Amino acid sequence: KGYFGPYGGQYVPEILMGALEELEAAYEGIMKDESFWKEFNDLLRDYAGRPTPLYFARRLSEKYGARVYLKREDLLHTGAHKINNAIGQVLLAKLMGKTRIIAETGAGQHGVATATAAALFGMECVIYMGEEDTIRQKLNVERMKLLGAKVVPVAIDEALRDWITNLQTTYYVFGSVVGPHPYPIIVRNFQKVIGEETKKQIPEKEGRLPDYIVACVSGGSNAAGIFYPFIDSGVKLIGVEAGGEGLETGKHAASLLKGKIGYLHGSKTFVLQDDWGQVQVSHSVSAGLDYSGVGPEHAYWRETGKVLYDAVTDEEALDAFIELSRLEGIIPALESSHALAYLKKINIKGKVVVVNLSGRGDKDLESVLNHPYVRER
Amino acid sequence: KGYFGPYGGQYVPEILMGALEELEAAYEGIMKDESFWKEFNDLLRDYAGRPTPLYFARRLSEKYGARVYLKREDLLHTGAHKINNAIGQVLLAKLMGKTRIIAETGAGQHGVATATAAALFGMECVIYMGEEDTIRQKLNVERMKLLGAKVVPVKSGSRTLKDAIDEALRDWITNLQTTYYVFGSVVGPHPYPIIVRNFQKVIGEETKKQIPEKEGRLPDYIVACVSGGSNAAGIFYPFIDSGVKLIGVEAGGEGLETGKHAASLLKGKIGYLHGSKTFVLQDDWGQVQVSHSVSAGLDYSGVGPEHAYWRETGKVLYDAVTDEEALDAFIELSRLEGIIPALESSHALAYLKKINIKGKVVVVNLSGRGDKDLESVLNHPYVRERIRL
Ligand SMILES: Cc1ncc(COP(=O)(O)O)c(C=O)c1O
Ligand SMILES: Cc1ncc(COP(=O)(O)O)c(C=O)c1O
Ligand SMILES: [K+]
Ligand SMILES: [K+]
């Protein structure tokens, strides 16, 4: 229970177990509540904009001699897949009687999605963010403030302390399939709607299950959402981690490829550590992939071989960012640009490939243009 | 032909009539071209994201004691209804054999939507934008250049939407052989008003089928913002003479009696602007005046001739809201529904306070999202004073 094979668990201090048991019990009581999931799927349709299209990128398919299809999660409300999980967890907080929503964010994407869902349900919202990340991401900070959320500059530790201090009224929204049980299973079950839509959409366009399904992986929420309905179906599922400046450079975030077994934020999983078990700081041109750990379900999928994993560098992601913008007129998130950049490293000639476009790249345009590799290009 | 009652026509230099007649014939030819409307509707579904949902705004409905539904055009690719028209016209332009696309833009939405359609169809693109708008919309300018389009800031006149159209029209006449002009609203000479409206009426057609599934009858009100009027004509057209009260909201600026607004229908006079006989903000000597609005998308001295016809016959009711009222509705929807609306659409949302809707079914056309307006809203003196509590 709470383990994907040997990975996962609840490796947390004892002061946090009271909240986890309450959440684990409330979530189990809605696993077979059709009124909950119907209300969840109605908001996904009318509020988030689901189902998302499965768009055939003709100009991109002709470039690689393949049939590249893009699952357009960039068209959701707020512009990223994060709204799927944020809506579900705040709905869960509504059933639990919570009146206050809190979360942490580094880039600001999950912070905006959380403040959005909190305003939809009419709850108080407090977003915790590093004081350095606030000064840089002033636009997303003002987005959250416009949505009615209080932004507290300082991270996860301060937010978790808030959760325990005000457990009577406060719910904590985890942004990815990380952390202690039951958060990894909760987020994956709120994100699998991606793969379930793709499973019903790809036969209406090809009459055949896809050959490849590619997605970027940091924490792993968008990949697990599109991979889970395709586990053990013959489709080659490929997760792409953040290679940073290079896997052999120590400036990356490929937790599955270069990490070791460890405990991060309550989860037994692969964590970037040194030889002495000290967690190392990750690095990536995409702030959405700047995480030292990875979801335990992705560690279990790699061990059992049900999903393959590789990585692409920062420069290669910046190329796929410019490529999709000029060839298809879609400005992709720098996160999803890693999954698009992997179209070059595999032979897809005559194959049907589905890429999970996890978000739009409007928020990354300033960072891409100011990058020294793009400036010199 | 080409007129909506007395309004419309082709009041253009004679050298433009050859291009207008060619476009009119090319458009009338694709009327039954099932492959064109299939590829257009297929791109609307898979590339733009249609159909857009009809969202019930529970907290907004509770505040006004009504049943308020939002047509979520903010969820489309590029984030505004402008993508509907940009895809249809650039597709038409590609099939006509053109190789160059130009367009005007105010806030940058039509400029992005055109460059987006130009990149999708692999066509050279040049966007004309008022210099005062380029400095305040640096994000959209860089979006356009990333899509492969050239952005030219117009430095003449008031350096806004109207002057951008002026310079863009001078480009079109100079390069009639290769260049297609994508008009961004239901304005300009025939057949542009009818073309843009027919590409946008999918909004109203989806709404007509969605509202009975949620309420079992037609709504009492449909509200949309009107400057040029393309998003309003798209949602109004299928409901003309249906009994639903259709309300178009113009930009009142600082006030309809301050000389700083863009309410062409309410304060303008009959005139000629960019090839169309319609209502135009003019002085006593018949010279077009400079418009003003907190929203760059509504900053236009003219209005579509179809709206002038609808106002004259009373098929649509027209009114205005001020900059401050639109700013309030912008903040209101953000906090009540978690939706940051375009400042253009915020004029329609502001009109919920002006109608007696206690117990009514109201559909608001949410024509776009307000990410582009964040800085303009927060830096506005009225909002800054509100922030000061
Ligand atoms: C658009 C987008 N995709 C993906 C991610 C990474 O999220 P995850 O790996 O948890 O799905 C982010 C940032 O969190 C993002 O903004
Ligand atoms: C998001 C949005 N909504 C509405 C409008 C109004 O345009 P129109 O009157 O042609 O519908 C614009 C720009 O002008 C816009 O960018
Ligand atoms: K990682
Ligand atoms: K006007």
Side-chain angles (χ1 to χ4, degrees), chain A residues 2-31 33 36-61 63-94 96-130 134 137 140-156 159-160 162-199 201-203 205-279 281-345 347 350-365 367-377, chain B residues 2-31 33 35-37 39-41 43-134 136-137 140-169 171-208 210-286 288-311 313-389:
Chain A
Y3 283 84
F4 306 91
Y7 305 105
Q10 291 181 326
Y11 299 85
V12 299
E14 193 58 24
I15 194 55
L16 200 50
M17 284 294 303
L20 291 180
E21 291 167 339
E22 163 214 67
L23 172 69
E24 187 185 344
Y27 184 62
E28 220 88 84
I30 57 102
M31 299 288 326
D33 186 282
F36 171 85
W37 298 92
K38 187 262 192 324
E39 180 177 355
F40 172 60
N41 288 287
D42 287 358
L43 293 166
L44 283 190
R45 271 185 298 272
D46 284 350
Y47 189 67
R50 301 214 77 92
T52 52
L54 182 56
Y55 160 76
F56 171 66
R58 172 161 55 62
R59 318 211 29 214
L60 189 63
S61 296
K63 157 149 208 213
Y64 300 103
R67 275 175 99 64
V68 181
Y69 289 83
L70 305 182
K71 184 58 168 157
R72 299 288 306 281
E73 301 297 291
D74 64 308
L75 298 182
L76 295 153
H77 185 42
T78 69
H81 72 284
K82 295 294 188 179
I83 196 64
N84 296 328
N85 165 61
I87 287 175
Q89 293 205 40
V90 177
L91 178 63
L92 180 58
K94 172 75 148 41
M96 293 174 68
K98 311 286 188 173
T99 63
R100 188 166 162 273
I101 301 299
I102 70 170
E104 70 76 47
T105 191
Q109 183 68 56
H110 180 246
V112 167
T114 294
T116 299
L120 161 65
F121 282 88
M123 297 195 200
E124 294 185 328
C125 189
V126 180
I127 304 298
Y128 285 91
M129 202 185 217
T134 54
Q137 291 287 250
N140 280 292
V141 160
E142 297 172 329
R143 268 184 202 81
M144 305 184 246
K145 274 163 164 178
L146 189 57
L147 297 159
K150 190 198 315 173
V151 184
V152 178
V154 278
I156 303 203
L160 289 174
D162 195 317
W163 189 27
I164 306 145
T165 303
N166 316 288
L167 200 38
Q168 181 102 32
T169 62
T170 292
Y171 183 101
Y172 183 96
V173 184
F174 256 103
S176 189
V177 288
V178 302
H181 178 82
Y183 278 107
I185 184 67
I186 282 166
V187 180
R188 182 255 274 163
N189 279 346
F190 283 145
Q191 292 284 359
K192 63 185 176 184
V193 65
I194 301 177
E196 291 175 349
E197 285 175 6
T198 311
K199 164 167 285 189
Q201 279 174 333
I202 200 44
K205 295 299 196 59
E206 289 290 324
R208 159 165 94 72
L209 279 189
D211 297 293
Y212 288 92
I213 293 190
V214 192
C216 68
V217 176
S218 190
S221 61
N222 90 87
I226 203 177
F227 285 168
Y228 181 73
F230 291 95
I231 291 296
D232 292 320
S233 65
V235 187
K236 296 201 144 42
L237 317 172
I238 302 182
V240 189
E241 271 179 334
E245 313 183 0
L247 297 177
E248 335 297 332
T249 70
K251 301 260 287 300
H252 60 94
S255 301
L256 283 170
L257 268 38
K258 308 277 293 188
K260 295 135 209 182
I261 273 276
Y263 311 88
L264 179 69
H265 298 140
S267 180
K268 183 176 180 175
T269 182
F270 275 77
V271 185
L272 298 185
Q273 321 153 65
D274 63 359
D275 291 306
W276 303 83
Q278 171 66 51
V279 57
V281 173
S282 51
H283 223 67
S284 179
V285 69
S286 164
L289 309 185
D290 221 336
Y291 189 55
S292 295
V294 65
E297 190 160 38
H298 286 290
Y300 164 76
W301 279 335
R302 158 148 152 286
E303 163 152 11
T304 62
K306 301 172 181 299
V307 176
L308 320 171
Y309 294 93
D310 204 352
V312 303
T313 84
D314 286 347
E315 295 179 355
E316 292 168 340
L318 293 170
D319 286 4
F321 179 92
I322 304 175
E323 173 169 305
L324 193 72
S325 300
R326 304 226 218 110
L327 289 188
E328 294 286 343
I330 310 174
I331 308 179
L334 252 179
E335 295 79 12
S336 345
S337 298
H338 290 65
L340 284 155
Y342 204 71
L343 283 158
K344 287 177 151 40
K345 323 226 152 243
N347 179 270
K351 298 260 161 286
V352 175
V353 173
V354 173
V355 187
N356 198 22
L357 197 32
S358 53
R360 59 173 181 248
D362 301 26
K363 86 223 198 295
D364 301 315
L365 196 32
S367 301
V368 166
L369 294 189
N370 290 335
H371 197 286
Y373 163 79
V374 176
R375 289 236 280 270
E376 266 272 317
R377 172 170 146 160
Chain B
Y3 283 81
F4 305 91
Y7 311 103
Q10 298 169 325
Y11 296 89
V12 301
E14 194 68 31
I15 203 64
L16 266 181
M17 295 286 317
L20 296 182
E21 293 165 2
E22 170 182 89
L23 177 58
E24 179 187 6
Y27 178 72
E28 277 167 3
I30 55 84
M31 292 262 89
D33 194 349
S35 87
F36 166 81
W37 295 98
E39 180 179 352
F40 171 64
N41 274 350
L43 286 194
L44 287 196
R45 200 199 47 241
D46 285 3
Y47 190 71
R50 305 213 70 90
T52 59
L54 185 60
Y55 164 67
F56 174 69
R58 180 187 62 80
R59 295 188 62 207
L60 192 63
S61 299
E62 271 166 32
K63 173 173 186 177
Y64 292 101
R67 304 194 63 82
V68 179
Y69 293 87
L70 311 177
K71 186 56 171 166
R72 301 286 310 283
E73 297 297 308
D74 60 307
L75 294 184
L76 296 163
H77 189 44
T78 71
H81 74 288
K82 300 283 177 163
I83 193 64
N84 296 325
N85 166 63
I87 277 155
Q89 286 201 53
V90 170
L91 173 56
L92 185 64
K94 190 87 188 306
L95 304 187
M96 293 183 27
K98 296 301 170 188
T99 49
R100 187 167 170 265
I101 300 294
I102 65 176
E104 82 287 359
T105 193
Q109 278 307 130
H110 183 242
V112 165
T114 292
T116 295
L120 169 64
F121 290 101
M123 296 191 71
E124 181 188 332
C125 190
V126 180
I127 301 296
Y128 288 86
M129 203 175 179
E131 188 192 49
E132 304 293 320
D133 297 318
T134 62
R136 304 170 136 251
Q137 318 270 6
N140 280 339
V141 172
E142 279 161 335
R143 274 214 281 176
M144 279 185 261
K145 270 138 156 199
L146 180 72
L147 298 159
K150 166 144 153 166
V151 183
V152 180
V154 179
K155 302 167 199 153
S156 55
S158 53
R159 284 114 47 211
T160 42
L161 184 46
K162 184 234 177 300
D163 303 287
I165 304 183
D166 285 343
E167 205 62 30
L169 283 178
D171 186 305
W172 194 24
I173 273 158
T174 308
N175 305 277
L176 284 175
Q177 162 56 37
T178 55
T179 300
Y180 181 98
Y181 192 111
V182 185
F183 262 101
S185 191
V186 284
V187 298
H190 177 80
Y192 279 108
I194 185 86
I195 284 178
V196 178
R197 178 254 273 164
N198 277 342
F199 281 151
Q200 293 285 1
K201 68 183 179 187
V202 58
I203 301 173
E205 287 174 341
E206 292 176 3
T207 301
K208 203 181 226 272
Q210 282 164 328
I211 186 67
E213 298 170 359
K214 297 198 152 71
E215 294 285 337
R217 63 188 185 99
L218 295 193
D220 308 277
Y221 295 86
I222 302 182
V223 189
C225 66
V226 178
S227 192
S230 75
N231 88 84
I235 201 167
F236 286 167
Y237 183 75
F239 291 90
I240 297 298
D241 292 324
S242 70
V244 183
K245 297 195 201 95
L246 312 177
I247 298 180
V249 189
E250 294 198 309
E254 310 176 2
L256 292 185
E257 311 301 319
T258 67
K260 307 231 236 152
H261 58 78
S264 304
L265 281 169
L266 304 181
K267 304 297 302 187
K269 305 111 181 183
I270 189 46
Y272 311 93
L273 180 62
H274 298 139
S276 178
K277 184 178 182 177
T278 181
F279 269 80
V280 179
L281 294 180
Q282 313 171 47
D283 63 1
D284 301 289
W285 300 91
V288 54
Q289 291 168 135
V290 177
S291 52
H292 301 106
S293 180
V294 72
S295 153
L298 304 189
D299 197 5
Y300 184 57
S301 295
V303 66
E306 191 156 28
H307 288 282
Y309 165 75
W310 281 337
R311 193 268 296 272
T313 60
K315 300 180 180 302
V316 179
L317 275 35
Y318 294 91
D319 207 348
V321 303
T322 63
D323 291 336
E324 292 188 352
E325 284 164 341
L327 284 167
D328 285 345
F330 180 98
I331 293 162
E332 177 185 79
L333 192 76
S334 294
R335 269 137 192 290
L336 281 181
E337 299 293 337
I339 303 175
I340 305 182
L343 261 185
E344 296 79 15
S345 326
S346 299
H347 285 66
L349 291 161
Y351 209 70
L352 294 170
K353 290 189 169 190
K354 297 299 176 57
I355 51 192
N356 194 179
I357 62 181
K358 210 146 279 187
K360 301 295 181 305
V361 171
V362 186
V363 174
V364 185
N365 197 19
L366 190 38
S367 53
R369 53 183 201 242
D371 293 79
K372 59 176 169 58
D373 306 303
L374 262 185
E375 295 203 341
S376 308
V377 166
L378 295 173
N379 264 79
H380 195 279
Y382 171 72
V383 181
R384 249 161 199 261
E385 181 78 342
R386 273 197 57 175
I387 283 171
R388 242 200 64 221
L389 302 175

